Amino acid sequence: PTHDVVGVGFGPANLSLAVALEESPAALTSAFFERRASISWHQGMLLPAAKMQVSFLKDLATFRNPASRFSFVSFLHERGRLVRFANNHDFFPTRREFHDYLEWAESKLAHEVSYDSEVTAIRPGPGRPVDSVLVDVSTPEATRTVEARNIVISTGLVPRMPAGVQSDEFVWHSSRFLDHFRDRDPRSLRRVAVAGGGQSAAEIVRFLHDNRPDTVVHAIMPSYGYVVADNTPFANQIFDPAAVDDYFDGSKQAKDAFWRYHRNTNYSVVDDEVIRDLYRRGYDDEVAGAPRLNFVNLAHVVGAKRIADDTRVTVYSMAREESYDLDVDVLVCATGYDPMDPGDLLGELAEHCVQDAEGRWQVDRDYRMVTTPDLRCGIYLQGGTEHTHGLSSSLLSNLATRSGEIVSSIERRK
Amino acid sequence: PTHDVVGVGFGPANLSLAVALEESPAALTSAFFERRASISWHQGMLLPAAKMQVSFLKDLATFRNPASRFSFVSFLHERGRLVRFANNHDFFPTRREFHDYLEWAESKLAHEVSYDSEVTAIRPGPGRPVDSVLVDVSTPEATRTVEARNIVISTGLVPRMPAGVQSDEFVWHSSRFLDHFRDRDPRSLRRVAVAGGGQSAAEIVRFLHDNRPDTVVHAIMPSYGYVVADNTPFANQIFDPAAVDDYFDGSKQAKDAFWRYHRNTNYSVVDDEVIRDLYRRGYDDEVAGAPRLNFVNLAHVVGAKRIADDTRVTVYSMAREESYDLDVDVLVCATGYDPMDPGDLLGELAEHCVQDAEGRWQVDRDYRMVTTPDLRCGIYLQGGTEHTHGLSSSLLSNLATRSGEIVSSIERRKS
Amino acid sequence: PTHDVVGVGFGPANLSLAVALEESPAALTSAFFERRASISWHQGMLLPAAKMQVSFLKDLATFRNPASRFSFVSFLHERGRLVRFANNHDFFPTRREFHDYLEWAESKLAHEVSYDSEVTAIRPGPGRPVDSVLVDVSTPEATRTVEARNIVISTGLVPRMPAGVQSDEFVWHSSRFLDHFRDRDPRSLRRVAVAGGGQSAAEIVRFLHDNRPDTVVHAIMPSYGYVVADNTPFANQIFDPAAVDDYFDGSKQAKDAFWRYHRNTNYSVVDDEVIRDLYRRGYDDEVAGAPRLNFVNLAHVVGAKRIADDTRVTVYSMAREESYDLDVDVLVCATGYDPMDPGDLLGELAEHCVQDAEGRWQVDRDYRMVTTPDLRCGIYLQGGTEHTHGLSSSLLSNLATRSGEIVSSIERRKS
Amino acid sequence: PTHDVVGVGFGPANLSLAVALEESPAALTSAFFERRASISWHQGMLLPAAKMQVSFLKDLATFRNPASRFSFVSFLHERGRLVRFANNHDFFPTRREFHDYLEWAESKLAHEVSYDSEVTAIRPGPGRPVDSVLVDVSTPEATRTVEARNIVISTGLVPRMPAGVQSDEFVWHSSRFLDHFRDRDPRSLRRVAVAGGGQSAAEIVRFLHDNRPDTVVHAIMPSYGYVVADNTPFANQIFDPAAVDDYFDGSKQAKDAFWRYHRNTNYSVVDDEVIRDLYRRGYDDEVAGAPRLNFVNLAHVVGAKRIADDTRVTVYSMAREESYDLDVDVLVCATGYDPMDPGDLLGELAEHCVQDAEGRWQVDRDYRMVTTPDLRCGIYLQGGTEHTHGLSSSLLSNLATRSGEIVSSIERRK
Ligand SMILES: Cc1cc2nc3c(=O)[nH]c(=O)nc-3n(C[C@H](O)[C@H](O)[C@H](O)COP(=O)(O)OP(=O)(O)OC[C@H]3O[C@@H](n4cnc5c(N)ncnc54)[C@H](O)[C@@H]3O)c2cc1C
Ligand SMILES: Cc1cc2nc3c(=O)[nH]c(=O)nc-3n(C[C@H](O)[C@H](O)[C@H](O)COP(=O)(O)OP(=O)(O)OC[C@H]3O[C@@H](n4cnc5c(N)ncnc54)[C@H](O)[C@@H]3O)c2cc1C
Ligand SMILES: Cc1cc2nc3c(=O)[nH]c(=O)nc-3n(C[C@H](O)[C@H](O)[C@H](O)COP(=O)(O)OP(=O)(O)OC[C@H]3O[C@@H](n4cnc5c(N)ncnc54)[C@H](O)[C@@H]3O)c2cc1C
Numbered sequence A, D: 001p002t003h004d005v006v007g008v009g010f011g012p013a014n015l016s017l018a019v020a021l022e023e024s025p026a027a028l029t030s031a032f033f034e035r036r037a038s039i040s041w042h043q044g045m046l047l048p049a050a051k052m053q054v055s056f057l058k059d060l061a062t063f064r065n066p067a068s069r070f071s072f073v074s075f076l077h078e079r080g081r082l083v084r085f086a087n088n089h090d091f092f093p094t095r096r097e098f099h100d101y102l103e104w105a106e107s108k109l110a111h112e113v114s115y116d117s118e119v120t121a122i123r124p125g126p127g128r129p130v131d132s133v134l135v136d137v138s139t140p141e142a143t144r145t146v147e148a149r150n151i152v153i154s155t156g157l158v159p160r161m162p163a164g165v166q167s168d169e170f171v172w173h174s175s176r177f178l179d180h181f182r183d184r185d186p187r188s189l190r191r192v193a194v195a196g197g198g199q200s201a202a203e204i205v206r207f208l209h210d211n212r213p214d215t216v217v218h219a220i221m222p223s224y225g226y227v228v229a230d231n232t233p234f235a236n237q238i239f240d241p242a243a244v245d246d247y248f249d250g251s252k253q254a255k256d257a258f259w260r261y262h263r264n265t266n267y268s269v270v271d272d273e274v275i276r277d278l279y280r281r282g283y284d285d286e287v288a289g290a291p292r293l294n295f296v297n298l299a300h301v302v303g304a305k306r307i308a309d310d311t312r313v314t315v316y317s318m319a320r321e322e323s324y325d326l327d328v329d330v331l332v333c334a335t336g337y338d339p340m341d342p343g344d345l346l347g348e349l350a351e352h353c354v355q356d357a358e359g360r361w362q363v364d365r366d367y368r369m370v371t372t373p374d375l376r377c378g379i380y381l382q383g384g385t386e387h388t389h390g391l392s393s394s395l396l397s398n399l400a401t402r403s404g405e406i407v408s409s410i411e412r413r414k
Numbered sequence B, C: 001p002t003h004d005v006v007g008v009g010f011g012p013a014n015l016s017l018a019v020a021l022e023e024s025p026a027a028l029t030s031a032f033f034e035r036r037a038s039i040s041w042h043q044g045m046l047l048p049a050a051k052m053q054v055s056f057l058k059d060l061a062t063f064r065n066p067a068s069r070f071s072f073v074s075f076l077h078e079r080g081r082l083v084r085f086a087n088n089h090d091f092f093p094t095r096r097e098f099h100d101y102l103e104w105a106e107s108k109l110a111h112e113v114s115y116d117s118e119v120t121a122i123r124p125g126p127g128r129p130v131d132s133v134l135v136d137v138s139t140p141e142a143t144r145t146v147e148a149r150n151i152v153i154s155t156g157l158v159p160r161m162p163a164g165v166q167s168d169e170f171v172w173h174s175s176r177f178l179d180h181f182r183d184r185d186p187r188s189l190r191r192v193a194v195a196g197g198g199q200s201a202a203e204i205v206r207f208l209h210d211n212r213p214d215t216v217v218h219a220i221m222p223s224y225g226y227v228v229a230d231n232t233p234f235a236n237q238i239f240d241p242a243a244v245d246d247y248f249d250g251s252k253q254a255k256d257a258f259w260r261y262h263r264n265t266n267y268s269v270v271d272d273e274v275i276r277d278l279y280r281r282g283y284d285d286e287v288a289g290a291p292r293l294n295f296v297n298l299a300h301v302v303g304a305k306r307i308a309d310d311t312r313v314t315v316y317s318m319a320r321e322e323s324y325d326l327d328v329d330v331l332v333c334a335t336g337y338d339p340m341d342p343g344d345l346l347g348e349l350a351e352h353c354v355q356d357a358e359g360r361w362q363v364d365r366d367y368r369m370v371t372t373p374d375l376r377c378g379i380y381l382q383g384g385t386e387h388t389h390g391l392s393s394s395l396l397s398n399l400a401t402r403s404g405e406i407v408s409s410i411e412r413r414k415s
């Protein structure tokens, strides 16, 4: 039984793919495999106050199909909260509500997703010129293999730690903040260091400050202060569906300009309101004579070691150009992520995949990896396309349009 | 050919009714009559900067049917502006764009509306009890009559002038501001008086100021300054579909409390952004030493008379408790509207319609007038239900739900 | 030793008076008496997030003297927080910081205030006509009497509880919320009822929600939802120094209009940010399936009784027009205040104080009580002048100008 | 008569210096020379809606003296507008009002400024070591020379045009926009091109759009859209008085970090409200079917030539790596400014003034140029200190403190 398309991973991207498949007139067979037990969308960072960075109109389908049964508005309506939500006049739902939205959509979905199913490898099918791929899936009980004419890889970002710093019992990446934090005796973390100057770092510091009144926090970051995230309407157009064509068709010179002028829309920047809330927090503490937030600016975390009951964090100060030690209970590294890389899963099919001058994967406008004639099956990427398609490649900004374009590409090539 | 339902008037209310009809599985026959040439939604007040007072989610259908082909989001999508609109992060479209939305929906609609068709009267059909009404329609050429088992009256508000002031060539109601304004030589409106302290008054004064740099404006109003319109989320709940049941089922006491505490959500109040814009305008003029906006507070317009080249406006000052005259070129009365009243159109049928203690029409929860057993056909009101259904009755706030409830009521009674 | 002026009470009002005295060229002798041990400015409501309802420019002196050593800006500068504050771009300091400001100013003040000194009575001095008053002061040790040519009464508002409800161990007025709250085992207050729809009620509910996650709160109020406080610039002008003259010189009709159109600026209304925050709180709880905030609208608290381990609150519902009981741990009444009334403290002198038609005290533009010629000494009111001077009489809005006008009045009669 | 201090230029900087002098207990003699007829603070850009980029608390004196007779609050009070202003709850006055503030303060000032007085040169006074400088002043009638123990140079920024584009009758720098614009028949500016992506460019396009309903505007800029200006409270601290010490004492590495992370607080960025207003303007025009604002992004103006009534603008497109011609009536270059340079004016005295590795002037913390021992007189810079003191050097952000620091330095050395 050979499937038209197999989806590796079930995050919002393949969920929107599943939705695009169901809404398409095309009769396409599909299968989806998720390693986790259920949809799990950055749960380690599902902090109480945390808010979507994207408008509710940027959902699973609305920009493609403005009257979808899987739209956020449909979700609100079924949950009987649409009117309530409208009264709030806020385009940004909480991260917590968006997670329910993902679950709700997955549930309404006709197709059944296979959970606890890790894709361990992708191999060429019996064939030359290869017309299918073989997908190795490992469940808790057995292992199996499925065959597909197309695959879509959407396995998400991978946590990046500071150079020379490894995860440990007392050194956590922000992606695993709540996992570790809920385990711990509160009074066990009176001193916390958080490295980074982006949204994650800011949200964690905020949470720590609001969660217990005695916790002392050290925010270590290279900038002089948090930098604001730009989502004003003209700059925000880099996230438009149409901006994908501009980026894609544009020269390397133009591509560089997107990153040069608008990196501050997405990376290493914090939302206005969180910045202002932290500042109010710090200000009221000074009035009260009880400072707790210590902002260590122009600085990098360069090392961590345990030493008795303390975590010894080594900080490099750019101002003085030297290092020093900071003793805390826990070090949280909110130091970001590296992009998706298909190269690992692909194993050997990589030999038939064409790379560019800089050594990265060539990708067509329709998100399909460029291959030699030896390979006739499709490898689509949702993620890992920053260099070809632009800043929206790993965001929720363009799920509806991308997923539809991939489904169209697959129907066209049948 | 007796229709299941005839709609009198084609504003947003009956348009949403038409949409509800098409969306319903029920096969209901209908006809709609509009006296204007096309949809015309307060065009006299379609000022350049004017913005909706209602969120885009409160459209023709979305609260009833979250995936409607007639939703504002569908409209944006077809007009290839959804992405652009989303980038703006504003829930409130311009009045101009909303007008576009109404036209767009009307066009997409299967039913063809009869324009240029004034309903002059509604009369009882044959038989007793009366099972149908007869609708008299006057077109420019001819006149005819159509029969219906149900009728929905949605003819809109009616302009209300100050007591003892009549509109003229130089005394306009705000509803007819742009009609008159575009037809006049710019150099002939150097002095304008605007009466009222509500949204209309504020918007007109703003426009006059932005429009020509030398125009002098007198804003005459009873309050000490513009009062802000409340649309904070808890108070704004009075516009919820569910709030209709609370108002309806509630005692007269409870009803009066809605009006007592939350009148300032709708009447005689101005949107925050417009108030602040007017204040910056006035402030910058003082810095420049060139004041043009004269705010005449604690005051009413009580008379107007034309004398040579001047419109002489008589103003009563509450502070001094005396009257005085103000000479201007034009007086604009932004003094509001009276509610829809089905009484005029109904004529003979009114005798079978039951009134309450205060002499107002009784209406069922499904917007159907209460009648004696002599009358079996359904008369539904979209508008004119402030006293039974609450503050949302004349607004866009609840179009989707109301229209659906009326269509359901009609399908039910057929069955 | 006869003083030019004695001040009864030391809240912001008399502290601005003390400042006005020090800044005046006039050599005036004065004494101030406060019952409390130190300045205590609504400490029972100094909640963590609580913010001033007045701009930092409206401080002890700035509107009268733009370069005062007692301005809020001076305070920030000395506390080394001016630059930090400026970066925040918020005109509204916290209530906590403002308290700091009051203490700082009081300290910087040359004059020494007499604390733990309750003024028990004011009596006529020797002579006829009366040229001085005698002020009876009770300290913890002794009692004494001081003599003054003028007296300024600024004793603040007095808590008002719902009719038929009395303070008790489990029934608190909002003014004494933190006093009782700190004094209670946290697991003893799992169910709280808060009566009222104003700023205090909103702030207390917000606090309860944020303080422990398990607390269930009943917000009981007559409106359908919190009503927003109007502070938009035109309406906000009723708080201007100049608005005092407009209100004062205006007819009773005009005075009524101020209250009729602009009570939404001050009484029974909630700040936009607080309303918004409460609504988000309620919304997120619904998403989580763990509702805690129960909004009981169109309702009054009409009684309270203690029954075993429960405070039984009797609630009247306007919608159903019937009463029912509500069992909670504590009832907090955030039901507002009655104005300052100089009369209690005046005793014998009040005979010579002229009242108006409605039986209230007549007051001159300079805040001086109108007396029959039998009295020659000056009695000034800071507070208790809502009926003569308008809505700013009990606020921080106009401290600088009011205090200056009273000092001027006193200097000019000494002359 | 040798003066303790002579001020070259009378903009906000030397005006705050004059104020600091008057408020100081020190009896210092001074003289100020301004070339223009009166205070003239970017009048070419005093557009109707234009707003200060700095809070009213950042005025001539308030951060140094919180109860100054020259504060903005004192100004409002005397102009009987304090209450009105307070009601409006806006920290940012209009540029127009701020200009009145400057005139008001200059007028209240006891000292009399010499206008129509251009400083043409600064020369060493008699003796070795040099204990004084000689200041050559050219008036319309005569020329004279004054002697000073110290000099403070505050001559402001100098307009910078695009490479290969010269000012002309139809090519204006933004600094001279209103000068040219008022002198033109309205029906002769139906097509305008504006080059630049900063505050000036945005403000001019806004004005053009709002001024006449038929004007067509081409906004040419290198970014994909306007980038928002960061003035959130943590990042905004780079403008703090204390941030000057951090920048000054910090290493070259730290200094670079200020510019790398926070250049978007000041250069090539546009205020949130202005961006939003332009976007609404463009949106409403699309609804009306009458587009007038053409945003030409990822582009530079590279040339201009007059060709029979059309100003022919040559535009380089980064996307297509191609150039092309655009015909308009006027080209406005809102392409920024170069910093103040004391070198111009100093002439012979440069020899006793020490440069750094990169060839820039060395300056002490108190804004005094570093000189060899052959020069003893003080040369102070208000402006031209970006490289030693940081981003606030040319701004209004820190007038009160800087001016006080300089007055103190002079009193201490006397
Ligand atoms: C806290 C946070 C941080 C973020 N960081 C960034 C950032 O740094 N840069 C940026 O551009 N966007 C970032 N995002 C956006 C983020 O990518 C996504 O919003 C969301 O995860 C969308 O991408 P996705 O569809 O690929 O889902 P991905 O959620 O991240 O997850 C898809 C699934 O792949 C599964 N998976 C992976 N490998 C296998 C396998 N071999 N077998 C089976 N299942 C597998 C995972 O278990 C997962 O459920 C962040 C968002 C949040 C909330
Ligand atoms: C400037 C402005 C002012 C407003 N004033 C108020 C106010 O004061 N109070 C309030 O609650 N809301 C007010 N509104 C809201 C207004 O009611 C609604 O936005 C909207 O028009 C209501 O929809 P409707 O369909 O019921 O009435 P409508 O849009 O007013 O009217 C529907 C149609 O009925 C037609 N019609 C009337 N009589 C006949 C007939 N005999 N035969 C055939 N057709 C007929 C009309 O020509 C019209 O096209 C105002 C809105 C604006 C923009
Ligand atoms: C939580 C809160 C609630 C408020 N409620 C209202 C309201 O309902 N309506 C309104 O218009 N404004 C209200 N305000 C404003 C309040 O009145 C002012 O902020 C402020 O306290 C007014 O100045 P006073 O100096 O007039 O105040 P009062 O501060 O309260 O100061 C009077 C002082 O005199 C002392 N005193 C009293 N009697 C004697 C005596 N016999 N002898 C010696 N000392 C005495 C008192 O101990 C007290 O310290 C409220 C403010 C807050 C923060």
Ligand SMILES: Cc1cc2nc3c(=O)[nH]c(=O)nc-3n(C[C@H](O)[C@H](O)[C@H](O)COP(=O)(O)OP(=O)(O)OC[C@H]3O[C@@H](n4cnc5c(N)ncnc54)[C@H](O)[C@@H]3O)c2cc1C
Binding pocket: D008, D009, D010, D011, D012, D013, D014, D033, D034, D035, D036, D040, D041, D042, D045, D117, D118, D119, D120, D154, D155, D156, D157, D200, D336, D337, D382, D383, D394, D395, D396
């Ligand atoms: C529209 C606008 C654009 C701006 N552009 C920038 C920018 O690109 N980068 C930045 O950091 N800040 C910029 N600023 C800030 C600007 O520098 C400041 O606001 C302010 O003017 C700086 O203070 P100053 O005293 O140095 O002013 P400068 O006003 O410009 O004052 C110098 C004065 O000295 C006079 N002068 C010059 N030479 C002589 C001479 N030889 N003899 C006598 N008098 C002389 C000049 O005529 C002038 O009046 C801008 C501000 C505005 C409003």
Ligand SMILES: NC(=O)c1ccc[n+]([C@@H]2O[C@H](COP(=O)([O-])OP(=O)(O)OC[C@H]3O[C@@H](n4cnc5c(N)ncnc54)[C@H](OP(=O)(O)O)[C@@H]3O)[C@@H](O)[C@H]2O)c1
Binding pocket: A045, A050, A051, A052, A053, A095, A162, A163, A174, A195, A196, A197, A198, A199, A200, A201, A203, A220, A221, A222, A266, A267, A268, A269, A299, A300, A301, A302, A334, A335, A336, A337
């Ligand atoms: N609620 C939400 O939806 C939500 C929540 C969290 C994140 N996000 C999104 O996820 C994306 C990434 O956010 P992120 O904050 O996790 O990653 P990020 O934006 O790349 O932030 C990483 C930060 O860590 C700094 N850093 C790097 N190495 C360091 C070191 N050795 N020591 C100290 N600091 C160091 C970086 O400095 P440099 O600038 O020099 O690299 C940068 O400030 C963003 O698009 C963000 O908006 C969304």
Ligand SMILES: NC(=O)c1ccc[n+]([C@@H]2O[C@H](COP(=O)([O-])OP(=O)(O)OC[C@H]3O[C@@H](n4cnc5c(N)ncnc54)[C@H](OP(=O)(O)O)[C@@H]3O)[C@@H](O)[C@H]2O)c1
Binding pocket: B045, B050, B051, B052, B053, B054, B095, B162, B163, B174, B195, B196, B197, B198, B199, B200, B201, B203, B220, B221, B222, B265, B266, B267, B268, B269, B299, B300, B301, B302, B334, B335, B336, B337
């Ligand atoms: N979506 C939009 O663009 C838009 C535009 C306009 C209106 N609307 C809405 O539709 C409704 C229309 O209201 P409106 O603005 O037209 O008017 P309005 O709110 O009904 O009130 C009219 C105003 O005139 C005053 N007034 C009455 N008699 C007067 C007299 N004799 N002299 C002077 N002033 C007098 C009233 O004061 P009193 O309080 O004393 O009566 C009031 O200020 C509002 O609810 C509004 O929100 C929407």
Ligand SMILES: NC(=O)c1ccc[n+]([C@@H]2O[C@H](COP(=O)([O-])OP(=O)(O)OC[C@H]3O[C@@H](n4cnc5c(N)ncnc54)[C@H](OP(=O)(O)O)[C@@H]3O)[C@@H](O)[C@H]2O)c1
Binding pocket: D045, D050, D051, D052, D053, D095, D162, D163, D174, D195, D196, D197, D198, D199, D200, D201, D203, D220, D221, D222, D266, D267, D268, D269, D299, D300, D301, D302, D334, D335, D336, D337
């Ligand atoms: N109301 C006010 O107080 C006010 C008004 C105006 C300005 N200002 C202040 O003055 C400072 C700068 O103002 P500004 O806008 O005049 O200068 P600016 O911020 O330096 O802006 C210069 C702009 O010109 C662009 N550019 C340079 N060469 C170009 C070319 N050949 N073709 C097209 N574009 C070109 C730049 O692009 P690149 O980034 O690639 O160089 C940049 O976007 C700011 O701090 C601003 O806030 C204040």
Ligand SMILES: NCCC[C@H](N)C(=O)O
Binding pocket: A053, A054, A055, A058, A230, A231, A236, A239, A265, A266, A395, A397
């Ligand atoms: N980092 C995510 C930002 C979302 C983006 N501003 C958008 O509106 O698409």
Ligand SMILES: NCCC[C@H](N)C(=O)O
Binding pocket: B053, B054, B055, B058, B231, B236, B239, B265, B266, B395, B396, B397, B398
């Ligand atoms: N003035 C119209 C009121 C709109 C109402 N707040 C609503 O959201 O439906």
Ligand SMILES: NCCC[C@H](N)C(=O)O
Binding pocket: D053, D054, D055, D058, D230, D231, D236, D239, D265, D266, D395, D396, D397
């Ligand atoms: N472009 C000038 C900005 C100045 C800075 N935001 C400040 O407050 O000083």
Ligand SMILES: [K+]
Binding pocket: A021, A022, A023, A024, A025, A026, A027, A028
């Ligand atoms: K399908």
Ligand SMILES: [K+]
Binding pocket: A106, A107, A108, A109, A110, A111, A112, A113
């Ligand atoms: K399912």
Ligand SMILES: [K+]
Binding pocket: B021, B022, B023, B024, B025, B026, B027, B028
């Ligand atoms: K149908």
Ligand SMILES: [K+]
Binding pocket: B106, B107, B108, B109, B110, B111, B112, B113
């Ligand atoms: K149609």
Ligand SMILES: [K+]
Binding pocket: C021, C022, C023, C024, C025, C026, C027, C028
């Ligand atoms: K004195």
Ligand SMILES: [K+]
Binding pocket: D021, D022, D023, D024, D025, D026, D027, D028
């Ligand atoms: K001096």
Ligand SMILES: [K+]
Binding pocket: D106, D107, D108, D109, D110, D111, D112, D113
């Ligand atoms: K002078």
